[PDB]
RNA sequence: CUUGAGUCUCGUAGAGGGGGGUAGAAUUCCAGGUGUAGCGGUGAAAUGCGUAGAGAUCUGGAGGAAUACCGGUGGCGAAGGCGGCCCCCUGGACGAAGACUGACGCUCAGGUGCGAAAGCGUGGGGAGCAAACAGGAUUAGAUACCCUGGUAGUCCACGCCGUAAACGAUGUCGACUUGGAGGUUGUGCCCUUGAGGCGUGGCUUCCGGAGCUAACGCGUUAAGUCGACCGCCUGGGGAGUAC
RNA sequence: AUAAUGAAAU
């Protein structure tokens, strides 16, 4: 399945990249599975870490009702 | 583990040349350095059982290398243990 | 699920939108699963059984298209 | 010496002290034979969720290289200062100098 | 009394009962009704029909404030999630929002044990 | 002597271990506003809470236990086991191209360490739910299953105890013997068509050939064909009991 | 929802 990060040869996923990270969360704020997106496992783990860092810094929400 | 600078210093001190990384003397000296270093770590973290397996393995390896050296050449053995201050 | 009614929109359409959104979020499944305590042994057993059943069904259904019924 | 990335957030009603703060911290780091590789002041941003009944906080970002004691003292300073409301410190493998995504599309 | 013109309906739908409460936009109550108080007991209290009747009675009980627009909050898994909303729209308010506010923990307290009957 | 076994140089993936900080969701309790007859629970009920104002809804405060989504017949560890984010100390594994020592090895009775839940001692802490215990019920009876309450314990520091269907019911090390489909993690080359081909290592899931097996089944991660060392069995009860 | 028992041989 198509994986954008493998296509573009990325080295790190950059918790500061809100524009990219927004494509990988539902409208409730939850992390989208990998069998729906096509991502590889390495990059899926990196992505989860980045989303958690952003949530803590308050650049992303935890839920849709705060 | 030990750092590159300390490793190179010990190799220079104890080997016949900077490329002699496989002699019994060099191996024993490196093991002794790391065993001495870890005493400080284990005096503060007394319930770190998983790290202590590596230390015990180091101790056993040093014992075996010393026995082999004592069997093959007594003079080198005596000089090395004097230089490192090892005995009970 | 937060649903806002658009201008000129009827009520049944908004109700259906709300139902679909709730189903996608999956709140009823969570509430049902969190009603009683489950032991870790039970949890692991359930996971393994589900995986084995799916694999066996796939093998059978893929091998059942090589024979004629009549 | 090791490489660190630092981010800190400041109360909206005290934006007039950010330059003095940056100057003081830069001096503290450079006084011990360190270096500063990236500095950015993002300005006021809307928060994702309230913190202490606030929105609209002020953000600053740094990438530095220094010894450990200096960073420990800096963390203590953050803890006891009252204008700072949140901070984060992370380690990096190498020095970073490029521009961030926040200063390329704002 | 005092006219309000904008309200919120809270719906508490559990496996055994349904509670409907109408409130202003600041959380102050104005009236309420329940399925167990509308003439249904036991095995008839946990049906969609009882919830419908309860919503009708709650709508009737707030007619002196002249409410026009309503928001709707729903909480719980029981039967009575949608019948109440239909009944309100029929009783004649204009619905502007619908939100689900069911509480979910992120691995918090230990639940009770399983029933062996 | 260099092929077994080790040391050195550059990188890579990981819920491996010890210590210290911190964030967001939810349950309970305390103090206030709005409002008024029910709430809660079951196969059906009543013990219980409530006009001394509950249940519901909104604002402020306290406390201590666990980390949704990601999350998979996925990963790490000698076994027991290990899951939010950040820092400090620390153990093992794997790959590419070289240099170095020169059999420095394998197994192990006695011995010494580690070792789930419950339990014991001293000092702390205590939302949630829970042996014992108390009261509704069901029943011919009900010292039970079901309902309403509830303390030891479950949590933390230090010290004991040494057992589990502690299981793959399969000891450790080495060599050899037809295939197919996947997962995860490194690495070399390119016709060139820069997004695709051709190789070469480690760990792991499922099917199946020869052989083997009382059968069920195992099958290059052997229960096949061989070598080195250790532990254990000899009809069912009495008994893993008595001294 | 609950809801027990049946000498030995032929």
Curated annotation (Swiss-Prot), chain A:
RNA-binding among keywords: yes
GO MF annotations in UniProt: mRNA 5'-UTR binding; small ribosomal subunit rRNA binding; structural constituent of ribosome
A GO-annotated cellular component: cytosol
GO process annotations (BP): cytoplasmic translation; translation
Alphabetized InterPro entries for the sequence: Ribosomal_bS18 (IPR001648), Ribosomal_bS18_CS (IPR018275), Ribosomal_bS18_sf (IPR036870)
Keywords on record: Acetylation, Ribonucleoprotein, Ribosomal protein, RNA-binding, rRNA-binding
Record keyword S-adenosyl-L-methionine present: no
Family the entry assigns: Belongs to the bacterial ribosomal protein bS18 family.
Role, per record: Binds as a heterodimer with protein bS6 to the central domain of the 16S rRNA, where it helps stabilize the platform of the 30S subunit.
Quaternary structure (record): Part of the 30S ribosomal subunit. Forms a tight heterodimer with protein bS6.
NCBIfam families, per the entry: S18 (TIGR00165)
Protein name: Small ribosomal subunit protein bS18
Organism: Escherichia coli (strain K12)
From Swiss-Prot, chain B:
The entry's keywords: Ribonucleoprotein, Ribosomal protein, RNA-binding, rRNA-binding, Translation regulation
Originating organism: Escherichia coli (strain K12)
Function of the molecule: One of the primary rRNA binding proteins, it binds directly to 16S rRNA where it helps nucleate assembly of the platform of the 30S subunit by binding and bridging several RNA helices of the 16S rRNA. Binds to its own mRNA, stabilizing it 5-UTR and preventing its translation. In the E.coli 70S ribosome it has been modeled to contact the 23S rRNA of the 50S subunit forming part of bridge B4. In the two 3.5 A resolved ribosome structures there are minor differences between side-chain conformations.
The protein's name: Small ribosomal subunit protein uS15
GO CC terms, sorted: cytoplasm; cytosol; cytosolic small ribosomal subunit
Gene3D superfamilies for this protein: 6.10.250.3130, S15/NS1, RNA-binding (1.10.287.10)
Superkingdom of source: Bacteria
Induction (record text): Part of the metY operon that extends to pnp, also has its own promoter.
GO MF entries: rRNA binding; small ribosomal subunit rRNA binding; structural constituent of ribosome
PROSITE patterns assigned: RIBOSOMAL_S15
From Swiss-Prot, chain D:
PTM description: 5 different forms of the protein, varying only in the number of C-terminal glutamate residues, were isolated. The sequence shown is form bS6-6, which is the longest. The first two Glu are encoded by the rpsF gene, the other Glu are added post-translationally by the RimK enzyme.
Residue list for modification N6-acetyllysine: 93
GO biological process: cytoplasmic translation
Coiled-coil intervals, chain numbering: none
Keywords, sorted A to Z: Acetylation, Ribonucleoprotein, Ribosomal protein, RNA-binding, rRNA-binding
GO cellular component: a single term: cytoplasm
GO molecular function, one term: structural constituent of ribosome
Entry similarity comment: Belongs to the bacterial ribosomal protein bS6 family.
Protein purpose: Binds together with bS18 to 16S ribosomal RNA.
Assembly: Part of the 30S ribosomal subunit. Interacts weakly with uL2 in one of the 3.5 A resolved structures.
UniProt name for this protein: Small ribosomal subunit protein bS6
Underlying gene: rpsF
UniProtKB/Swiss-Prot annotation, chain E:
N-terminal signal peptide: none
GO terms of molecular function: small ribosomal subunit rRNA binding; structural constituent of ribosome
Superkingdom of the source species: Bacteria
GO cellular component: cytoplasm; cytosol; cytosolic small ribosomal subunit
Regions crossing the membrane: none
Keywords: Methylation, Ribonucleoprotein, Ribosomal protein, RNA-binding, rRNA-binding
InterPro entries: Ribosomal_uS11, Ribosomal_uS11_bac-type, Ribosomal_uS11_CS, Ribosomal_uS11_sf
GO BP terms, alphabetized: cytoplasmic translation; translation
Task of the protein: Located on the platform of the 30S subunit, it bridges several disparate RNA helices of the 16S rRNA. Forms part of the Shine-Dalgarno cleft in the 70S ribosome.
Note: Has been predicted to contact the N-terminal domain of IF-3 based on footprint studies; exactly how IF-3 interacts with the 30S subunit is controversial.
Family designation: Belongs to the universal ribosomal protein uS11 family.
Assembly notes: Part of the 30S ribosomal subunit. Interacts with proteins uS7 and bS18. Cross-links to IF-3. In stalled ribosomes contacts ribosome rescue factor SmrB.
Name assigned to this protein: Small ribosomal subunit protein uS11
UniProt organism field: Escherichia coli (strain K12)
Gene symbol of the encoding locus: rpsK
């Amino acid at each position: 399945k198509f994986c954008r990060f493998t296509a573009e040869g990325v080295q790190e996923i950059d918790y500061k990249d809100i524009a990219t990270l927004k494509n990988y969360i539902t409208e409730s704020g939850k992390i989208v599975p990998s069998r729906i997106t096509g991502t590889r496992a390495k990059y899926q783990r990196q992505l989860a870490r980045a989303i958690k860092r952003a949530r803590y810094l308050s650049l992303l929400p935890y839920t849709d009702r705060h | 583990s030990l750092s590159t600078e300390a490793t190179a210093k010990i190799v220079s001190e104890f080997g016949r040349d900077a490329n002699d990384t496989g002699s019994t003397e060099v191996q024993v000296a490196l093991l002794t350095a790391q065993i001495n270093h870890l005493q400080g770590h284990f005096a503060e973290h007394k319930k770190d059982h998983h790290s202590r397996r590596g230390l015990l393995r180091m101790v056993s390896q040093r014992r075996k290398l010393l026995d082999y050296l004592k069997r093959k050449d007594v003079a080198r053995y005596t000089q090395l243990i004097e230089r490192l201050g090892l005995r009970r | 699920p937060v649903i806002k009614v658009r201008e000129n929109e009827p009520f049944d359409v908004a109700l259906r939108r709300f139902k679909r959104s709730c189903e996608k979020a999956g709140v009823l499944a969570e509430v049902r699963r969190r009603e009683f305590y489950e032991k870790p042994t039970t949890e692991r057993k359930r996971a393994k059984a589900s995986a084995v059943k799916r694999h066996a069904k796939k093998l059978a259904r893929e091998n059942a298209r090589r024979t004629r019924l009549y | 010496m090791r490489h660190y990335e630092i981010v800190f957030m400041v109360h909206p009603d005290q934006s007039e002290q950010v330059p003095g703060m940056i100057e003081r911290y830069t001096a503290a780091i450079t006084g011990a034979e360190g270096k500063i590789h990236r500095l950015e002041d993002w300005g006021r941003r809307q928060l994702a969720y309230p913190i202490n009944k606030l929105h609209k906080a002020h953000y600053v970002l740094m990438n530095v290289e220094a010894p450990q004691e200096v960073i420990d003292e800096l963390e203590t300073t953050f803890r006891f200062n009252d204008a700072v409301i949140r901070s984060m410190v992370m380690r990096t493998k190498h020095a970073v100098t490029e521009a961030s995504p926040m200063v390329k599309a704002k | 009394r005092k006219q309000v013109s904008d309200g919120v309906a809270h719906i508490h739908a559990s496996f055994n009962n349904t509670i409907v409460t109408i409130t202003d936009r600041q959380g102050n109550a104005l009236g309420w009704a329940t399925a167990g108080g509308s003439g249904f007991r036991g095995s008839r209290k946990s049906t969609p029909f009882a919830a419908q009747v309860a919503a009708e009675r709650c709508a009737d009980a707030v007619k002196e404030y002249g409410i026009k627009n309503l928001e709707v909050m729903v909480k719980g898994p029981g039967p009575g999630r949608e019948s109440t909303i239909r009944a309100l729209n029929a009783a004649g308010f204009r619905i502007t929002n619908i939100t689900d506010v069911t509480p979910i923990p992120h691995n918090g307290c230990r639940p009770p044990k399983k029933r062996r009957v």
